[PDB]
Amino acid sequence: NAMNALVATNRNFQRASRILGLDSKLEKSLLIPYREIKVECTIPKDDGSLVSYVGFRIQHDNARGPMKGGIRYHPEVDPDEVNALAQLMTWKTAVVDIPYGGAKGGIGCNPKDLSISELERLTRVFTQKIHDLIGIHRDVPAPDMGTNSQTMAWILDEYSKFHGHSPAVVTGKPIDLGGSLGREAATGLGVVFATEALFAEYGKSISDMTFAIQGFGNVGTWAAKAIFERGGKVVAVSDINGAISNPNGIDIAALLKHKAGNGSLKDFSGGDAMNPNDLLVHDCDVLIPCALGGVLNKENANDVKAKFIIEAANHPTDPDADEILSKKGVIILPDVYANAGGVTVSYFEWVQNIQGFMWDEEKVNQELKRYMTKAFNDIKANCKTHNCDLRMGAFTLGLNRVARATLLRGWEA
Amino acid sequence: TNRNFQRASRILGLDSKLEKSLLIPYREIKVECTIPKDDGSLVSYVGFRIQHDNARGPMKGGIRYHPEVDPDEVNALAQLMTWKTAVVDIPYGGAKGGIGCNPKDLSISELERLTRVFTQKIHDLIGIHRDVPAPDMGTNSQTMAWILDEYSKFHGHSPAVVTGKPIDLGGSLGREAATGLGVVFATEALFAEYGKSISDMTFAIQGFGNVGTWAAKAIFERGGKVVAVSDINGAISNPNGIDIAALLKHKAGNGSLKDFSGGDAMNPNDLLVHDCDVLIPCALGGVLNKENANDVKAKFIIEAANHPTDPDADEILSKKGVIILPDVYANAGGVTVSYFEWVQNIQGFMWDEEKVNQELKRYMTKAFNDIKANCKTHNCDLRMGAFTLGLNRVARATLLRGWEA
Amino acid sequence: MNALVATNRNFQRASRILGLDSKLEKSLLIPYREIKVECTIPKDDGSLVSYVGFRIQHDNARGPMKGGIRYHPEVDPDEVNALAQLMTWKTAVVDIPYGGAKGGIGCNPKDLSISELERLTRVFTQKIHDLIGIHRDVPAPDMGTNSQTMAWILDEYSKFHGHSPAVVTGKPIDLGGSLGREAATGLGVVFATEALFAEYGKSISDMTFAIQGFGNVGTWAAKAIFERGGKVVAVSDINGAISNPNGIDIAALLKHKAGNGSLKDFSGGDAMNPNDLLVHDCDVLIPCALGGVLNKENANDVKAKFIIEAANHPTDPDADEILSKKGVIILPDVYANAGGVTVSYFEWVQNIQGFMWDEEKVNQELKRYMTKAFNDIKANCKTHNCDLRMGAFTLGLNRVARATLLRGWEA
Ligand SMILES: NC(=O)c1ccc[n+]([C@@H]2O[C@H](COP(=O)([O-])OP(=O)(O)OC[C@H]3O[C@@H](n4cnc5c(N)ncnc54)[C@H](O)[C@@H]3O)[C@@H](O)[C@H]2O)c1
Ligand SMILES: NC(=O)c1ccc[n+]([C@@H]2O[C@H](COP(=O)([O-])OP(=O)(O)OC[C@H]3O[C@@H](n4cnc5c(N)ncnc54)[C@H](O)[C@@H]3O)[C@@H](O)[C@H]2O)c1
Ligand SMILES: NC(=O)c1ccc[n+]([C@@H]2O[C@H](COP(=O)([O-])OP(=O)(O)OC[C@H]3O[C@@H](n4cnc5c(N)ncnc54)[C@H](O)[C@@H]3O)[C@@H](O)[C@H]2O)c1
Ligand SMILES: O=C(O)c1cccc(C(=O)O)c1
Ligand SMILES: [Ca+2]
Ligand SMILES: [Ca+2]
Ligand SMILES: [Ca+2]
Ligand code: NA
Ligand code: NA
């Protein structure tokens, strides 16, 4: 069903470039990634047998600063997916106006099939194969799907053997190893800040709406929690194993405790088991994909019931679906704004580390709000000047900023 | 000592294999330091650096120029600095080093050459984010200036590479007063927990040096009544409280305590058993023992000197309901401000004195609250609450980092 | 030779007030390092041109070196050395943790296209990348260079060492430049003046001002004085001058200028002899234009009680003597115009901290630095029973001398 992820993202890039009127020589330069790296990651399993993976780091653009983006452990990781995500990082960092470029990495593995000692070895080997290509002022990784703060701990620890203690080389670290308060919740919280800014334009509140949510990991859990706390009615949640629904609202706080006690969604007592394939076409006001990309496509977009889609996941909606949904009257808050809370707080974590001195947690949340509000106000204005939809409003905002810094740096050797 | 670490480890439930790792220093270094004397003849010494642990950050710790060098003591002191940095939540581990020499046999140009050669021999083993030396017995801010200057030849201008620098070369404001003022901030936090205030308390202070003078000044300006003060030479007392400003002006004029006109001269041997609410040992260790602990009148003991109270006195004083703020925490103002010095250097932008003392108060207050919460968790006294808090923080960082190669 | 004569004289006088040892003095006058490098590029037509680039690194006892890059065909090593040495004293006066440097390329930028300038800037950076750096020596714009030049240096240097925003100042804001730079010098002039006047329990609004020069310094100084209730009664630039004894409306004058009006055509004042500027009736004179304008032939006719030296070296030694004798208080240039270098320090700090300040913070920090430095200068004048120029130079020199002596001399 999914359209190729890089095809889809390049169509969006082209659409934004045509709005800005970029010439084709500058456009070509901004499309092509600065550097693509593929490296062998081979480790012994716990029984001593060998397994070989290919690890990727795509460094898409560094005109606005060191490159930034997470590392994904997932069986569908491939060069196309990583190139698409790295490119999106470049635009997203420029949308929230933090001094980073864009990058992304990953390994095509299934963490569920690997022991924790095997994941550690795989993470350290991957770090050994890319340490020369990343760095505090060069490219700063972070967690994405299938990774978490413990993953980043291992990267920090292995990288520091080659370059000395380097807290700022990775973000999403545990608090005890230099992480920032607020970073774990930042993406889902940022999704809610972005949603609140949007709904304010319609005079609506989150407490007026019903929500369906696909995915229930780092982004989905914190997003659902924050919506729930503000009085939103979360009527359906899915993950890779099952789904749960309740037209009166799921008690998300109880769903999260159930999950932490290792329960499956479909066994939750406060809801009805649901086929997860029904999630995206479920009746709701607001749909929030928090899992894979490309899941809203030509084949299901006409059966979406929501009036709003908040892109918490990266590129959940492909260009075919964009157009179908636009004709249905659906408003889509794009990934390159809505899920930017995470990289924004990663920036604060990095600042705190290089300043050698941590901020109070209230400053982290004060600034997150300030950055997400400023960026929504920039997107609004850009939509007005370019008479475009929210996706292109944000995409052209970031692309234009990246073009401006690239031209400023020049091209002579 | 060994058994104490074991009780802390067991209170926390640490695995024996983790215990073993935490007791093995990260790295131990001995290097030849040979220099020409002023007359051109050679002298050879051995310099050393024990780098105990860096789970929580770069190591840090003093450089001792002293002839008696016991390897086991140097190891123990490095380890203690690992716990201490963790108690006050600053991002370092512990280290200790020095040179086995007698600085009284060396001219000032010989000491400089010795310091520079030593730095030449260890420059690859230290650094702003690796190991950050500091002054100790036999060394001072001039020693640190010479390390900075020589180290910077190898790695470029690196002010954060040592602490205790002169202000002209990036030292922090507030460094002189940091330990004694920190003692007072710690006491303010302790007292607030029991609902008490400096201004309602009487204090007896043993020792009137860098710590005692600043601690007394800070208490005095907060309305505390300093009713007794001693040093090695004598002692002075006044039940209505000594005018500490006038006593400090008197000390400064080369005046001795006993001849201070604003008080009644006292036998220094009477200091620890003096009537008072708070006793502050700021001089020597080993002063409260089995033979005199039952005679302490204070209900609070603020340990600024290192290990003033031995185990027998701890137990005697607990039976008496006396609360003892332990040295590892109470005197940590100095090491906390040395962190702030590193931060200021790293950021290339100095703090004014108000900001240094604000951050000092914030760190000392949050660390007391952390110690006390840890006491409630493990139902233990402040001494062990502080030890277990530092130890557990190091263990937690070590476990998060992992063990695979 | 403007900067050579001023700095050497002032250095020598300050050295003697302090009683510095002669061997220390000798060391302090020798620069740490002098570098000249060949910079050869192809022109747009592919033919070669070869220039000599240079960097004098005078002293780094108090920190990394700091100073401008001049693209300019006239290079006398003597003057460049003096400029680099003067930055060493100047950074010390305002308690900035830098030493002094000065560099450039012996070229005429008007003979070069914009792509040729970029290639030259990049080749120069290739030839000095190993000698500069964030904690080693931090260049900045100067005559013939600008923030675009700095962007090119940053870009090329980062190829050798990674993103290094703090390696230069004066950057475009898009690449880590600081807010508040344009107003920095003129606003700093007013902060220094406010500190000075407080010693008399007086304020800007008590005073009448005559301002010579109306460019980057003069406009911002005039603006800040006017908004502080100061009465600007005369202003000159190179083409003419105007006076108004009830105060020129600086707001309206700025509008006039912004509309391409010539100063002398502003209707809100009377025509005046631009020579009568320095000797105009006023309480405060602020030379903001040229060096060498107060000399033994006009110093006796100055009417101001206060001279605030914003320009470089507006007052020659003879005038300095005459004016001290008439009781005139002179706030010296090494201090008074230091807002520019102070904000460039703040830019480096922001880049090092990875996080830019808003303009209010910059201006708050600028005022703190300029005020503290006045207070330190004034304390030194009391200690040494000397005028403000020597109080400044003794302050900066003693800070460098102390840092040097502490670092030591053994190998
Ligand atoms: N982690 C961050 O800070 C962050 C920031 C910005 C955007 N994102 C994006 O958010 C998305 C989720 O990331 P995460 O960190 O929450 O990952 P995660 O590994 O923490 O969780 C992934 C979740 O998605 C579910 N899922 C996987 N495949 C599914 C499927 N086919 N159908 C339904 N559910 C499925 C998993 O079961 C799990 O609940 C990704 O697109 C990621 O790139 C992450
Ligand atoms: N980071 C740390 O662990 C740290 C920091 C600072 C000080 N300290 C502890 O504090 C103690 C005091 O430090 P300081 O810098 O103030 O020392 P100091 O040398 O400045 O002053 C010591 C004072 O103790 C007095 N004294 C010495 N022997 C005495 C005795 N027998 N009876 C009474 N008074 C006596 C001296 O006369 C002097 O007044 C140190 O010895 C150390 O134990 C530890
Ligand atoms: N040392 C420092 O850090 C520092 C910093 C900034 C400026 N300055 C000095 O301040 C002065 C002015 O700098 P700026 O940025 O305002 O320059 P600018 O070029 O922006 O303005 C110069 C002004 O002087 C006027 N002028 C020129 N020749 C004149 C003459 N003969 N009589 C009267 N007015 C004349 C011009 O018309 C213009 O109004 C210069 O001496 C400059 O070097 C020093
Ligand atoms: O840099 C980050 O923190 C990060 C981590 C994971 C995902 C993203 C993203 O923006 O998609 C950013
Ligand atoms: Ca160990
Ligand atoms: Ca010299
Ligand atoms: Ca040649
Ligand atoms: Na000799
Ligand atoms: Na050409």
User: CA C376 to CA C381: how far, in whole Å?
Assistant: 9
Q: Are B135 and B144 in contact (CB under 8 A)?
A: yes
Other beta carbons within 10 Å of A135: 18
User: CA B324 to CA B308: how far, in whole Å?
Assistant: 11
For the Cβ of C308 lying below 6 angstroms from any atom of ligand 3, the answer is no
Q: Which residue of C has its CA nearest to B147?
A: C407
DSSP state letter for B332 = T
- Between helix A5-20 and helix A390-409 the angle, nearest 10°, is 80
Q: Shortest Cα distance from C36 to chain B (angstroms)?
A: 21
A408: enclosing H helix or E strand? helix A390-409
Query: Reading across the β-sheet that carries B131-135, which strands appear in turn?
Result: B27-36, B42-51, B93-99, B59-65, B131-135
| Ligand that comes closest to the CA of residue B79 | 5
For the Cβ of A70 lying below 6 angstroms from any atom of ligand 4, the answer is yes
User: CA B51 to CA B55: how far, in whole Å?
Assistant: 11
Q: How many residues does chain C have?
A: 411
User: CA A192 to CA A224: how far, in whole Å?
Assistant: 9
Nearest residue to C251 via CA among C219, C281, C278, C283: C219
Q: Which two tokens stand for residue B316?
A: 């005697």
User: CA B116 to CA C37: how far, in whole Å?
Assistant: 33
Q: Interior CA angle at C42 toward C38 and C46, to 5°?
A: 155
Chain C contact probe: residue of A349, A374, A409, A411 with most C CBs at under 10 A: A409
User: CA A168 to CA A189: how far, in whole Å?
Assistant: 23
Q: Which residues line ligand 1 (CB under 6 A)?
A: A 143-146, 187, 214-220, 238-240, 276, 290-293, 312-314, 339, 342
Q: Are C201 and C207 in contact (CB under 8 A)?
A: no
Burial, C48: exposed, middle or buried (Cβ in 10 Å; 0-12, 13-18, 19+)?
exposed
B113 chain-C contacts, CB cut-off 8 A: 410-411
Please report, as a single letter, which amino acid is at residue B48: F
Q: Which residue of C has its CA nearest to B38?
A: C410
Rounded to 5 degrees, what are φ and ψ at B304? -95, -40
Helices (H) and strands (E) in chain C, counts: 13, 12
Cα radius of gyration rounded to whole Å, chain C: 21
Chains that touch A (3 or more CB pairs under 8 A): B, C
Chains that touch C (3 or more CB pairs under 8 A): A, B
Rounded to 5 degrees, what are φ and ψ at B194? -100, 5
Q: Are C52 and C128 in contact (CB under 8 A)?
A: no
Q: Interior CA angle at C70 toward C66 and C74, to 5°?
A: 135
Strand partners, C308: C331
| Sign for the pseudo-dihedral over CA of C263, C268, C274, C279 | negative
Residue A94 CB contacts under 8 Å (≥ 6 apart), including other chains = A64, A397, A398, A399, A401, A402
DSSP state letter for C275 = G
Count Cα atoms within 13 angstroms, Cβ side, for A246. 16
User: CA C91 to CA C397: how far, in whole Å?
Assistant: 10
CA–centroid distance, residue C22 to ligand 8 (Å): 21
Residue written as token pair 């030839």 = C127
Q: Are A238 and A266 in contact (CB under 8 A)?
A: no
Nearest residue to C284 via CA among C347, C351, C225, C365: C225
Rounded to 5 degrees, what are φ and ψ at C298? -115, -10
Q: Are C136 and C147 in contact (CB under 8 A)?
A: no
Residue A300 CB contacts under 8 Å (≥ 6 apart), including other chains = A1, A280, A281, A321
C136 chain-B contacts, CB cut-off 8 A: 156-157
Other beta carbons within 10 Å of A305: 14
Residue written as token pair 């108060």 = B361
CA–centroid distance, residue B287 to ligand 2 (Å): 12
String of DSSP letters for C67-109: EEEEE-S---HHHHHHHHHHHHHHHHHTT-S-EEEEEEESS-G
String of DSSP letters for C224-270: HHHHTT-EEEEEE-SS-EEE-TT---HHHHHHHHHTT--GGG-TTSE
Strand partners, A71: A105, A143
Burial, C163: exposed, middle or buried (Cβ in 10 Å; 0-12, 13-18, 19+)?
buried
Burial, B262: exposed, middle or buried (Cβ in 10 Å; 0-12, 13-18, 19+)?
middle
Q: How many residues does chain A have?
A: 413
| Sign for the pseudo-dihedral over CA of B313, B317, B318, B323 | negative
DSSP state letter for B180 = H
User: CA B215 to CA B197: how far, in whole Å?
Assistant: 15
Query: Reading across the β-sheet that carries A210-214, which strands appear in turn?
Result: A272-274, A243-245, A233-238, A210-214, A286-289, A308-310, A331-333
Strand partners, A103: A59
Residue B81 CB contacts under 8 Å (≥ 6 apart), including other chains = B52, B60, B61, B93, B94, B95, B96, B335
Known catalytic membership, residue B319? no
Residue of the CA atom closest to atom 1 of ligand 1: A144
Asked if residue A326 belongs to a known ligand binding site, the reply is no
Residue of the CA atom closest to atom 38 of ligand 1: A217
Q: Shortest Cα distance from C376 to chain A (angstroms)?
A: 29
Cβ-count burial B249-260 (b if 16+ within 10 Å, e if not): ebbeeeeebbeb
Residue of the CA atom closest to atom 2 of ligand 3: C337
Helices (H), B261-323: 311-319
Q: Are B46 and B23 in contact (CB under 8 A)?
A: no
User: CA B111 to CA B47: how far, in whole Å?
Assistant: 13
User: CA B398 to CA B385: how far, in whole Å?
Assistant: 20
Other beta carbons within 10 Å of A393: 25
Other beta carbons within 10 Å of B149: 22
Q: Mapping DSSP to helix (H, G, I), strand (E, B) and coil, where does residue C14 land?
A: helix
Residue written as token pair 């943790």 = C97
Strand partners, B95: B51
User: CA B218 to CA C76: how far, in whole Å?
Assistant: 58
Q: Are C280 and C243 in contact (CB under 8 A)?
A: yes
Cβ-count burial C290-318 (b if 16+ within 10 Å, e if not): ebbbbeeeebeebebebbbbbbbbbbbee
Q: Shortest Cα distance from A158 to chain B (angstroms)?
A: 8
Residue B65 CB contacts under 8 Å (≥ 6 apart), including other chains = B98, B99, B101, B103, B111, B137, B138, B139, B143
Chains that touch B (3 or more CB pairs under 8 A): A, C
User: CA B219 to CA B167: how far, in whole Å?
Assistant: 26
User: CA A125 to CA A106: how far, in whole Å?
Assistant: 13
User: CA C327 to CA C60: how far, in whole Å?
Assistant: 37
For the Cβ of B283 lying below 6 angstroms from any atom of ligand 2, the answer is yes
User: CA A21 to CA C335: how far, in whole Å?
Assistant: 50
Strand partners, C99: C65
Chain C contact probe: residue of A64, A67, A163, A408 with most C CBs at under 10 A: A408
Q: Are C96 and C345 in contact (CB under 8 A)?
A: yes
User: CA B182 to CA B366: how far, in whole Å?
Assistant: 12
**Interface touch A409/C152, C-beta < 8 Å:** yes
Q: Mapping DSSP to helix (H, G, I), strand (E, B) and coil, where does residue B23 land?
A: helix
User: CA A288 to CA A307: how far, in whole Å?
Assistant: 11
Please report, as a single letter, which amino acid is at residue A300: N
User: CA B394 to CA B403: how far, in whole Å?
Assistant: 15
Q: Are A370 and A348 in contact (CB under 8 A)?
A: no
CA–centroid distance, residue A79 to ligand 1 (Å): 19
Q: Are A165 and A334 in contact (CB under 8 A)?
A: no
User: CA C103 to CA C80: how far, in whole Å?
Assistant: 8
Long-range contacts of A304-307 (CB under 8 A, 24+ apart): A304/A280, A304/A328, A304/A330, A305/A281, A306/A212, A306/A330, A307/A331
Q: Mapping DSSP to helix (H, G, I), strand (E, B) and coil, where does residue B130 land?
A: coil
Q: Are B46 and B33 in contact (CB under 8 A)?
A: yes
- Between helix A24-31 and helix A390-409 the angle, nearest 10°, is 100
Q: Which two tokens stand for residue B194?
A: 């029991």
Other beta carbons within 10 Å of C235: 32
For the Cβ of B183 lying below 6 angstroms from any atom of ligand 2, the answer is no
What distance lies between CA B36 and its chain's CA centroid? 34
Helices (H), C144-209: 147-161, 184-198
DSSP state letter for C303 = -
| Ligand that comes closest to the CA of residue C400 | 6
Nearest residue to A304 via CA among A319, A315, A317: A317
Strand partners, B46: B32
For the Cβ of C215 lying below 6 angstroms from any atom of ligand 3, the answer is yes
Size of interface A-B (CB pairs under 8 A): 46
CA–centroid distance, residue A93 to ligand 4 (Å): 10
For the Cβ of B230 lying below 6 angstroms from any atom of ligand 2, the answer is yes
Residue written as token pair 């670490």 = B5
What distance lies between CA A309 and its chain's CA centroid? 15
What distance lies between CA A314 and its chain's CA centroid? 5
Helices (H), C311-338: 317-325, 333-336
User: CA A238 to CA A243: how far, in whole Å?
Assistant: 4
Q: Shortest Cα distance from C358 to chain A (angstroms)?
A: 13
What distance lies between CA B330 and its chain's CA centroid? 9
Which one of B58, B342, B347 has the shortest CB-CB distance to A165? B58
Other beta carbons within 10 Å of B228: 27
Q: Which two tokens stand for residue B335?
A: 């090491």
Q: Mapping DSSP to helix (H, G, I), strand (E, B) and coil, where does residue B33 land?
A: strand
DSSP state letter for B69 = -
User: CA C387 to CA A238: how far, in whole Å?
Assistant: 79
Q: How many residues does chain B have?
A: 405
- Pairing outcome for strands A331-333 and A308-310: parallel
Q: Are B69 and B77 in contact (CB under 8 A)?
A: no
| Ligand that comes closest to the CA of residue B137 | 2
Q: Mapping DSSP to helix (H, G, I), strand (E, B) and coil, where does residue A80 land?
A: helix
- Pairing outcome for strands A233-238 and A210-214: parallel
Please report, as a single letter, which amino acid is at residue B189: A
User: CA C96 to CA C98: how far, in whole Å?
Assistant: 6
For the Cβ of B335 lying below 6 angstroms from any atom of ligand 2, the answer is yes
Q: Are A160 and A166 in contact (CB under 8 A)?
A: yes
Name the binding residues of C for substrate.
Answer: 66, 90, 344
User: CA B260 to CA A248: how far, in whole Å?
Assistant: 81
Helices (H), B24-107: 71-87
Q: Which two tokens stand for residue B86?
A: 């963790």
Strand partners, B167: none
Q: Are B5 and B17 in contact (CB under 8 A)?
A: no
Q: Which two tokens stand for residue A89?
A: 């990082």
Long-range contacts of B123-128 (CB under 8 A, 24+ apart): B123/B150, B123/B151, B123/B154, B123/B155, B124/B154, B125/B27, B125/B29, B125/B49, B125/B51, B126/B49, B126/B151, B126/B161, B127/A164, B127/B58, B127/B155, B127/B158, B127/B161, B128/B58, B128/B158, B128/B160, B128/B161, B128/B342, B128/B345, B128/B346
Nearest residue to B55 via CA among B16, B12, B24, B26: B26
Burial, C405: exposed, middle or buried (Cβ in 10 Å; 0-12, 13-18, 19+)?
middle
Residue written as token pair 């690796």 = B130
Count Cα atoms within 13 angstroms, Cβ side, for B351. 23
Q: Are B93 and B52 in contact (CB under 8 A)?
A: yes
Domains and CATH numbers, chain A: 33-168 (3.40.50.10860), 186-338 (3.40.50.720)
Strand partners, A101: A67
Residue written as token pair 């963490």 = A111
In this structure, which residues have their CB less than 5 angstroms from ion ligand 9? C 44
